[PDB]
Tab-separated table of C-alpha atoms in Angstrom:
chain	number	residue	atom	x	y	z
A	111	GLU	CA	67.045	61.027	87.952
A	112	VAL	CA	68.703	64.427	87.616
A	113	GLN	CA	66.191	67.239	87.388
A	114	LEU	CA	66.557	70.990	87.421
A	115	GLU	CA	63.296	72.769	88.251
A	116	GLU	CA	63.063	76.467	87.498
A	117	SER	CA	60.688	79.004	89.062
A	118	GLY	CA	57.639	80.336	87.207
A	119	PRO	CA	57.277	83.135	84.649
A	120	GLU	CA	57.807	86.662	85.866
A	121	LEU	CA	56.116	89.924	84.926
A	122	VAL	CA	57.860	92.812	86.642
A	123	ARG	CA	58.368	96.540	86.248
A	124	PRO	CA	61.522	98.143	84.953
A	125	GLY	CA	63.999	99.344	87.567
A	126	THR	CA	63.043	96.576	89.983
A	127	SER	CA	65.003	93.418	90.809
A	128	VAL	CA	63.893	89.809	90.454
A	129	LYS	CA	65.240	86.611	91.931
A	130	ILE	CA	64.692	83.439	89.974
A	131	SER	CA	65.544	79.949	91.091
A	132	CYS	CA	66.825	76.578	89.895
A	133	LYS	CA	66.003	73.642	92.204
A	134	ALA	CA	68.178	70.602	91.598
A	135	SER	CA	67.501	66.962	92.426
A	136	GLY	CA	68.912	63.515	91.649
A	137	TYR	CA	72.605	64.166	92.442
A	138	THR	CA	75.026	65.632	94.995
A	139	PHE	CA	74.292	69.379	94.639
A	140	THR	CA	77.625	70.574	95.960
A	141	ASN	CA	79.618	68.488	93.523
A	142	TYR	CA	78.641	70.066	90.203
A	143	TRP	CA	78.912	73.492	88.608
A	144	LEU	CA	75.605	75.017	87.428
A	145	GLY	CA	75.581	77.583	84.641
A	146	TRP	CA	73.076	80.235	83.653
A	147	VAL	CA	72.365	81.484	80.131
A	148	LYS	CA	70.090	84.157	78.673
A	149	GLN	CA	67.896	83.761	75.565
A	150	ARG	CA	66.123	86.881	74.345
A	151	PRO	CA	62.913	86.357	72.334
A	152	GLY	CA	64.086	85.420	68.852
A	153	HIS	CA	67.716	85.690	69.963
A	154	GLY	CA	70.607	83.270	70.499
A	155	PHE	CA	72.327	82.454	73.825
A	156	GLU	CA	74.416	84.604	76.147
A	157	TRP	CA	76.413	83.242	79.093
A	158	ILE	CA	75.879	84.860	82.506
A	159	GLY	CA	77.838	82.815	85.041
A	160	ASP	CA	78.661	79.463	86.695
A	161	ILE	CA	78.350	78.609	90.399
A	162	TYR	CA	79.952	75.788	92.379
A	163	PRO	CA	77.722	75.171	95.410
A	164	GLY	CA	80.359	73.210	97.365
A	165	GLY	CA	82.561	76.293	97.349
A	166	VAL	CA	80.734	78.545	96.999
A	167	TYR	CA	82.675	79.682	93.927
A	168	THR	CA	81.480	81.660	90.910
A	169	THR	CA	82.842	82.680	87.526
A	170	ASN	CA	80.980	85.524	85.894
A	171	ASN	CA	80.401	87.409	82.664
A	172	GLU	CA	81.647	90.940	83.424
A	173	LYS	CA	79.250	92.218	80.805
A	174	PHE	CA	76.688	91.647	83.614
A	175	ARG	CA	78.614	93.109	86.566
A	176	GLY	CA	76.021	95.044	88.567
A	177	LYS	CA	73.161	93.331	86.783
A	178	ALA	CA	73.325	89.709	87.855
A	179	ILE	CA	74.449	87.844	90.975
A	180	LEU	CA	74.592	84.086	91.545
A	181	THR	CA	74.048	82.398	94.916
A	182	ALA	CA	73.182	78.944	96.192
A	183	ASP	CA	71.482	77.336	99.161
A	184	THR	CA	72.927	73.972	100.103
A	185	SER	CA	70.134	73.167	102.538
A	186	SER	CA	67.507	73.180	99.806
A	187	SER	CA	69.632	72.394	96.737
A	188	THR	CA	68.547	75.597	95.025
A	189	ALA	CA	70.594	77.980	92.895
A	190	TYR	CA	69.398	81.545	92.460
A	191	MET	CA	70.077	84.353	90.017
A	192	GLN	CA	69.221	87.900	91.081
A	193	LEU	CA	68.776	90.448	88.288
A	194	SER	CA	68.533	94.145	89.177
A	195	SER	CA	67.887	97.552	87.590
A	196	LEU	CA	65.754	95.666	85.116
A	197	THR	CA	65.110	96.873	81.587
A	198	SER	CA	63.298	95.510	78.521
A	199	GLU	CA	66.781	94.315	77.476
A	200	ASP	CA	66.553	91.840	80.378
A	201	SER	CA	63.295	90.442	78.982
A	202	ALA	CA	64.345	86.890	78.158
A	203	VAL	CA	64.072	83.244	78.999
A	204	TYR	CA	66.733	82.313	81.536
A	205	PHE	CA	68.024	78.731	81.740
A	206	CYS	CA	70.092	76.869	84.296
A	207	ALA	CA	72.270	73.903	83.367
A	208	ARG	CA	74.494	71.350	85.044
A	209	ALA	CA	78.107	70.931	83.929
A	210	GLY	CA	78.331	67.134	83.866
A	211	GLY	CA	82.042	67.163	84.720
A	212	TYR	CA	85.432	68.405	83.533
A	213	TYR	CA	84.654	70.707	80.616
A	214	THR	CA	82.073	68.173	79.355
A	215	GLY	CA	79.201	70.583	78.553
A	216	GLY	CA	75.708	70.837	80.049
A	217	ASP	CA	74.169	67.393	80.480
A	218	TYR	CA	70.943	68.419	82.265
A	219	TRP	CA	68.851	71.558	81.671
A	220	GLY	CA	66.081	73.414	83.447
A	221	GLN	CA	62.917	74.207	81.480
A	222	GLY	CA	63.763	77.918	81.584
A	223	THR	CA	62.190	80.944	83.301
A	224	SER	CA	60.469	83.621	81.262
A	225	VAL	CA	61.067	87.143	82.590
A	226	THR	CA	59.076	90.027	81.084
A	227	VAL	CA	60.080	93.582	82.023
A	228	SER	CA	57.122	95.883	81.321
A	229	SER	CA	55.089	98.750	82.779
A	230	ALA	CA	52.215	97.337	80.710
A	231	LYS	CA	49.386	95.683	82.517
A	232	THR	CA	48.250	92.090	82.380
A	233	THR	CA	45.282	91.628	80.018
A	234	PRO	CA	43.307	88.399	79.475
A	235	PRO	CA	42.562	87.155	75.985
A	236	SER	CA	39.390	87.220	73.989
A	237	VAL	CA	38.790	83.842	72.367
A	238	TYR	CA	36.623	83.694	69.277
A	239	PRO	CA	35.351	80.602	67.472
A	240	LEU	CA	36.285	80.045	63.817
A	241	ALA	CA	33.613	77.999	62.036
A	242	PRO	CA	33.193	77.800	58.244
A	243	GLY	CA	30.993	80.659	57.026
A	244	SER	CA	29.710	80.866	53.451
A	245	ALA	CA	31.499	78.471	51.108
A	246	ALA	CA	31.013	74.816	52.044
A	247	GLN	CA	34.586	74.179	53.186
A	248	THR	CA	36.055	70.993	51.717
A	249	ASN	CA	34.195	67.758	52.452
A	250	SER	CA	36.523	64.870	53.303
A	251	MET	CA	38.294	66.921	55.997
A	252	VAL	CA	36.994	70.024	57.786
A	253	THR	CA	39.147	72.787	59.286
A	254	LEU	CA	38.067	74.741	62.361
A	255	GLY	CA	39.888	77.182	64.607
A	256	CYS	CA	40.036	79.732	67.374
A	257	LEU	CA	41.193	83.352	67.302
A	258	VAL	CA	42.924	84.421	70.542
A	259	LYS	CA	43.020	88.181	70.695
A	260	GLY	CA	44.322	91.044	72.809
A	261	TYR	CA	46.278	89.594	75.706
A	262	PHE	CA	49.460	90.502	77.557
A	263	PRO	CA	51.988	89.157	78.404
A	264	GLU	CA	52.974	86.010	76.489
A	265	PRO	CA	52.297	83.168	76.564
A	266	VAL	CA	48.944	81.471	76.173
A	267	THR	CA	48.568	77.671	75.913
A	268	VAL	CA	46.044	76.384	73.368
A	269	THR	CA	44.661	72.866	73.347
A	270	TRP	CA	41.705	71.119	71.655
A	271	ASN	CA	39.352	68.815	73.590
A	272	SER	CA	41.527	69.366	76.620
A	273	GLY	CA	44.516	67.851	74.854
A	274	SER	CA	42.884	64.713	73.418
A	275	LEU	CA	42.659	66.348	70.019
A	276	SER	CA	46.292	66.870	69.055
A	277	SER	CA	46.506	65.672	65.458
A	278	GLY	CA	46.078	68.173	62.612
A	279	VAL	CA	46.559	71.143	64.942
A	280	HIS	CA	48.565	74.272	64.060
A	281	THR	CA	49.001	76.876	66.776
A	282	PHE	CA	50.564	79.988	65.244
A	283	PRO	CA	53.166	82.258	66.865
A	284	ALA	CA	51.643	85.439	68.374
A	285	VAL	CA	51.896	88.920	66.801
A	286	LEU	CA	52.365	91.957	69.049
A	287	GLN	CA	50.420	95.101	68.129
A	288	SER	CA	49.408	98.057	70.306
A	289	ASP	CA	50.801	96.438	73.453
A	290	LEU	CA	48.755	93.314	72.871
A	291	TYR	CA	49.218	89.863	71.375
A	292	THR	CA	47.113	87.874	68.941
A	293	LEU	CA	47.359	84.218	67.904
A	294	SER	CA	45.155	81.701	66.068
A	295	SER	CA	44.937	77.924	66.203
A	296	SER	CA	43.571	75.676	63.481
A	297	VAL	CA	42.412	72.081	63.791
A	298	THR	CA	41.487	69.716	60.960
A	299	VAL	CA	39.229	66.687	61.511
A	300	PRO	CA	37.322	64.330	59.227
A	301	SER	CA	34.073	65.947	57.987
A	302	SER	CA	31.828	63.105	59.150
A	303	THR	CA	33.032	63.699	62.705
A	304	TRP	CA	31.907	67.305	63.118
A	305	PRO	CA	29.687	68.483	64.537
A	306	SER	CA	28.830	64.907	65.615
A	307	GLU	CA	31.960	64.533	67.813
A	308	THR	CA	32.409	67.901	69.499
A	309	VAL	CA	35.484	70.082	68.993
A	310	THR	CA	36.334	72.681	71.667
A	311	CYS	CA	39.366	74.944	71.958
A	312	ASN	CA	40.905	75.652	75.388
A	313	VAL	CA	43.026	78.765	75.945
A	314	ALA	CA	45.013	79.157	79.162
A	315	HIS	CA	46.635	82.495	80.060
A	316	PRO	CA	48.626	81.960	83.263
A	317	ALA	CA	49.510	85.615	83.831
A	318	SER	CA	45.819	86.577	84.110
A	319	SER	CA	44.810	83.370	85.920
A	320	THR	CA	42.253	82.777	83.187
A	321	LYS	CA	41.126	79.929	80.956
A	322	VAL	CA	38.360	80.085	78.352
A	323	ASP	CA	36.811	77.336	76.295
A	324	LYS	CA	34.934	77.722	73.029
A	325	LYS	CA	33.040	74.826	71.441
A	326	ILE	CA	32.956	75.342	67.653
A	327	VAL	CA	29.433	75.002	66.380
A	328	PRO	CA	28.157	75.160	62.827
B	295	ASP	CA	85.256	88.449	73.287
B	296	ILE	CA	86.116	85.161	71.623
B	297	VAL	CA	83.722	85.461	68.668
B	298	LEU	CA	82.071	82.333	67.277
B	299	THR	CA	80.830	82.838	63.709
B	300	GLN	CA	77.952	80.691	62.347
B	301	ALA	CA	75.635	81.218	59.344
B	302	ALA	CA	72.041	81.659	60.521
B	303	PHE	CA	70.867	79.466	57.642
B	304	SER	CA	71.875	76.184	55.990
B	305	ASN	CA	70.836	74.583	52.685
B	306	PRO	CA	67.735	72.371	52.882
B	307	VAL	CA	68.794	68.780	53.345
B	308	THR	CA	67.057	65.653	52.038
B	309	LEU	CA	65.831	63.100	54.581
B	310	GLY	CA	68.535	60.415	55.028
B	311	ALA	CA	71.339	62.520	53.510
B	312	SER	CA	74.332	64.032	55.313
B	313	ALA	CA	74.392	67.526	56.779
B	314	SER	CA	77.212	69.708	57.993
B	315	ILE	CA	77.223	72.832	60.211
B	316	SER	CA	80.290	75.024	60.554
B	317	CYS	CA	81.570	77.284	63.301
B	318	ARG	CA	84.621	79.562	63.242
B	319	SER	CA	86.490	80.814	66.325
B	320	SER	CA	88.388	84.108	66.350
B	321	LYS	CA	91.005	82.499	68.592
B	322	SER	CA	92.332	78.991	69.125
B	323	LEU	CA	90.260	76.944	71.569
B	324	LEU	CA	93.173	74.685	72.423
B	325	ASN	CA	94.220	74.723	76.117
B	326	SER	CA	97.716	74.098	77.504
B	327	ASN	CA	96.409	70.751	78.760
B	328	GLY	CA	95.285	69.495	75.362
B	329	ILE	CA	91.532	70.099	75.530
B	330	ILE	CA	89.816	71.886	72.625
B	331	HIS	CA	87.014	73.911	74.180
B	332	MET	CA	84.288	73.466	71.552
B	333	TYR	CA	80.697	72.417	72.283
B	334	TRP	CA	77.626	71.870	70.114
B	335	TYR	CA	74.019	72.264	71.262
B	336	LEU	CA	70.721	71.781	69.454
B	337	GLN	CA	67.627	73.674	70.442
B	338	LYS	CA	64.150	72.802	69.182
B	339	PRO	CA	61.402	75.401	69.388
B	340	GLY	CA	59.932	75.656	72.840
B	341	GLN	CA	62.568	73.368	74.242
B	342	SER	CA	65.697	73.714	76.328
B	343	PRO	CA	69.005	73.112	74.527
B	344	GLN	CA	70.480	69.638	74.135
B	345	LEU	CA	74.198	68.848	74.257
B	346	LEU	CA	75.357	66.834	71.247
B	347	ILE	CA	79.143	67.202	71.142
B	348	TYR	CA	81.714	68.198	73.753
B	349	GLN	CA	85.423	68.978	73.499
B	350	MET	CA	85.153	69.318	69.724
B	351	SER	CA	84.628	65.686	68.907
B	352	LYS	CA	83.215	63.779	71.902
B	353	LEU	CA	79.650	62.453	71.661
B	354	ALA	CA	77.325	63.480	74.488
B	355	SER	CA	75.459	60.766	76.311
B	356	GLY	CA	71.894	60.943	75.007
B	357	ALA	CA	72.948	62.152	71.555
B	358	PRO	CA	72.608	59.665	68.681
B	359	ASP	CA	75.848	58.668	66.993
B	360	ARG	CA	74.553	60.114	63.765
B	361	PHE	CA	76.081	63.215	65.344
B	362	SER	CA	79.803	63.765	65.071
B	363	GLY	CA	82.232	66.643	65.486
B	364	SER	CA	85.633	67.681	64.205
B	365	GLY	CA	87.780	70.731	63.617
B	366	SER	CA	91.265	72.168	63.750
B	367	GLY	CA	91.539	74.574	66.709
B	368	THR	CA	89.711	77.483	64.922
B	369	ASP	CA	87.355	75.912	62.308
B	370	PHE	CA	84.830	73.378	63.598
B	371	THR	CA	82.266	71.201	61.889
B	372	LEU	CA	79.205	69.444	63.246
B	373	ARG	CA	78.108	66.579	60.990
B	374	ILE	CA	74.867	64.576	60.816
B	375	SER	CA	75.463	61.279	58.955
B	376	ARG	CA	71.809	60.675	58.097
B	377	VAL	CA	69.313	63.473	58.785
B	378	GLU	CA	65.878	62.808	60.256
B	379	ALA	CA	62.825	65.068	60.176
B	380	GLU	CA	62.977	65.589	63.945
B	381	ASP	CA	66.448	67.086	63.612
B	382	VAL	CA	65.055	70.444	62.611
B	383	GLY	CA	66.001	73.276	64.862
B	384	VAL	CA	68.855	75.573	65.668
B	385	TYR	CA	72.367	74.301	66.208
B	386	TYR	CA	74.713	76.273	68.436
B	387	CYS	CA	78.489	76.234	68.936
B	388	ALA	CA	80.021	77.445	72.198
B	389	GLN	CA	83.332	77.946	73.966
B	390	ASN	CA	84.519	77.990	77.552
B	391	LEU	CA	88.259	78.449	77.042
B	392	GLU	CA	88.366	82.107	78.085
B	393	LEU	CA	86.077	84.527	79.912
B	394	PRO	CA	83.532	85.486	79.006
B	395	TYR	CA	82.242	82.181	77.717
B	396	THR	CA	80.478	82.640	74.341
B	397	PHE	CA	77.984	81.067	71.938
B	398	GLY	CA	77.847	81.360	68.169
B	399	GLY	CA	74.704	82.880	66.605
B	400	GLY	CA	73.110	79.528	65.768
B	401	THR	CA	72.414	77.824	62.404
B	402	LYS	CA	68.875	76.634	61.565
B	403	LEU	CA	68.702	73.212	59.937
B	404	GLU	CA	65.975	72.672	57.359
B	405	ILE	CA	64.740	69.549	55.636
B	406	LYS	CA	64.147	69.489	51.905
B	407	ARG	CA	61.073	67.455	50.998
B	408	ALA	CA	58.769	67.126	48.033
B	409	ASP	CA	56.790	70.273	47.267
B	410	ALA	CA	53.275	70.385	48.694
B	411	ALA	CA	50.487	72.848	47.917
B	412	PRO	CA	48.787	74.638	50.824
B	413	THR	CA	45.371	73.721	52.163
B	414	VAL	CA	43.498	77.022	52.414
B	415	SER	CA	40.503	77.819	54.603
B	416	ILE	CA	38.767	81.156	55.276
B	417	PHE	CA	36.647	82.155	58.293
B	418	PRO	CA	34.440	85.227	58.831
B	419	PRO	CA	34.290	87.244	62.061
B	420	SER	CA	32.458	85.660	64.986
B	421	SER	CA	29.199	87.138	66.319
B	422	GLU	CA	31.093	87.583	69.581
B	423	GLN	CA	33.804	89.777	68.123
B	424	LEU	CA	31.424	91.877	66.019
B	425	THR	CA	29.535	92.702	69.206
B	426	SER	CA	32.789	94.290	70.459
B	427	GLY	CA	33.089	96.304	67.266
B	428	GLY	CA	35.848	94.234	65.727
B	429	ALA	CA	35.929	92.095	62.587
B	430	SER	CA	38.852	89.784	61.868
B	431	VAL	CA	38.777	87.536	58.825
B	432	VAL	CA	41.065	84.514	59.133
B	433	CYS	CA	42.770	82.461	56.442
B	434	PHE	CA	44.808	79.334	57.166
B	435	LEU	CA	47.374	78.079	54.660
B	436	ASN	CA	48.459	74.730	56.085
B	437	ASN	CA	51.065	72.064	55.402
B	438	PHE	CA	52.884	73.442	52.367
B	439	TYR	CA	56.461	73.152	51.042
B	440	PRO	CA	58.540	75.036	50.310
B	441	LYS	CA	58.256	77.816	52.889
B	442	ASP	CA	58.023	80.630	50.351
B	443	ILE	CA	54.415	81.696	49.923
B	444	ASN	CA	52.385	84.840	49.384
B	445	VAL	CA	48.845	85.819	50.354
B	446	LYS	CA	46.627	88.522	48.870
B	447	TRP	CA	43.375	89.780	50.387
B	448	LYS	CA	40.561	91.252	48.322
B	449	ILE	CA	37.450	93.087	49.495
B	450	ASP	CA	34.678	93.329	46.918
B	451	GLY	CA	37.351	92.292	44.432
B	452	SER	CA	39.802	95.034	45.366
B	453	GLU	CA	43.246	94.064	46.681
B	454	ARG	CA	43.619	94.916	50.358
B	455	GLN	CA	46.914	95.344	52.178
B	456	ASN	CA	45.976	97.477	55.212
B	457	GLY	CA	45.195	95.536	58.406
B	458	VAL	CA	46.823	92.277	57.372
B	459	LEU	CA	49.030	90.355	59.832
B	460	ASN	CA	50.808	87.091	58.932
B	461	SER	CA	52.455	84.417	61.095
B	462	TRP	CA	54.436	81.342	60.051
B	463	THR	CA	54.983	78.136	61.999
B	464	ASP	CA	58.395	76.500	62.326
B	465	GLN	CA	59.048	73.496	60.098
B	466	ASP	CA	56.965	70.524	61.303
B	467	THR	CA	59.183	67.932	63.029
B	468	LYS	CA	57.175	65.086	61.450
B	469	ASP	CA	56.026	65.980	57.942
B	470	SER	CA	58.580	68.781	57.250
B	471	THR	CA	55.921	71.175	55.951
B	472	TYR	CA	55.127	74.768	56.926
B	473	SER	CA	51.847	76.507	57.720
B	474	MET	CA	50.823	80.176	57.732
B	475	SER	CA	47.908	82.177	59.131
B	476	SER	CA	46.824	85.465	57.596
B	477	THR	CA	44.438	87.753	59.439
B	478	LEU	CA	42.701	90.846	58.063
B	479	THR	CA	41.460	92.907	60.944
B	480	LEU	CA	38.842	95.568	60.294
B	481	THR	CA	36.339	97.550	62.317
B	482	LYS	CA	32.729	96.458	62.295
B	483	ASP	CA	31.888	99.632	60.412
B	484	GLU	CA	34.260	98.813	57.619
B	485	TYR	CA	33.289	95.145	57.520
B	486	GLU	CA	29.600	95.989	57.087
B	487	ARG	CA	30.297	98.335	54.145
B	488	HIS	CA	31.422	95.462	51.899
B	489	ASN	CA	30.146	92.017	50.972
B	490	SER	CA	32.793	89.782	49.453
B	491	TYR	CA	35.941	88.744	51.312
B	492	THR	CA	38.656	86.727	49.596
B	493	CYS	CA	42.039	85.242	50.508
B	494	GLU	CA	44.278	84.068	47.619
B	495	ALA	CA	47.323	81.856	47.946
B	496	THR	CA	50.199	81.883	45.506
B	497	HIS	CA	52.798	79.123	45.866
B	498	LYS	CA	55.322	77.531	43.504
B	499	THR	CA	53.187	74.396	43.212
B	500	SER	CA	50.919	76.110	40.718
B	501	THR	CA	50.687	79.126	38.412
B	502	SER	CA	47.102	79.552	39.637
B	503	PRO	CA	46.317	81.060	43.042
B	504	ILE	CA	44.184	79.074	45.483
B	505	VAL	CA	41.120	81.231	46.106
B	506	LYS	CA	38.799	80.962	49.090
B	507	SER	CA	35.995	83.420	49.684
B	508	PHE	CA	32.796	84.252	51.487
B	509	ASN	CA	30.045	86.846	51.200
B	510	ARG	CA	28.668	88.573	54.310
B	511	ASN	CA	25.128	87.926	53.056
């Protein structure tokens, strides 16, 4: 089974360089071209370059000359992309992809690497419970939620009952204000089930090595 | 640059009906060897892109044969014979004839389904936040269609615009609805100077707003 495993999210300061990786498995590494593309938050795709590890050969987007360089290590079946003189313009998700053959497109994809170029410091979120206040909310169903406030950088991962509560969940995209992000998550369950069968939100923020759980209580 | 032009938006398409996406190339994508260098990718939110069509009209392994491609050497069309709800996302064209390789700007596919009114819920600040001197009042407007919707906040019956932040989900891949959160963020001081907090939803499914409220006391 062909897999392309990319390295973890990066938070780095402008003017530095970062080296991100794409570990391949399931096929002969030297035999296939790998391509790299850039996707800026809320943007489309931009092509950076292709690398043939059996060569090593590369074909590159001259719009990135001096910004990006592609290399590969045959011994560990890993392709790298080095980005330098970083700016907020470089803040993107970077993907690697295998060219399946002779101009046949990318048949396997990495999960992407998020790079965030900021002088801003990492800040963990505040998680607040959202329980119905004054106004007997519906009856047949009941909606609960969690407010996740004031973190940096993206993302956070929200779950309910550690993932076992997945139906009727809406996790909203974050809004960025005063260098910090805020998101909410709603969950709707049958009324007869709460607070009888507990409902807890779990918010993971990898950058700050933090997780916080809030049980929603009446 | 070989420039690939795509509309960011497409008309909403009924479940089971046909859809078409177009892409236009500023230069012919035909090679001396006969290949037409046109590729179509789909990308779903939070996912890596998926190859559907290669060399203008060849079906990628893993792509359902509902997907099909054609074109001349400059105008290309991606077609979906029968659209499914899970097909929502952004469709990209791409070329590798000439350097630099390029992508078109992507076209978002949307499903047309029967209108649905939002389910609205309001929540007051938590004790935990108030302790910190903050007071956010949250309103969820879930599972509605169509996407167009407006929210109005009122404090002690006066309309409030300042300190309101809105966020919309992407179209649901299963029920083809939309959801929206609206958050009014005040300081504790301001929150404590008023009593009634109201969120009102106005949507095409009714001439009457959907009103949810609470009173601090």
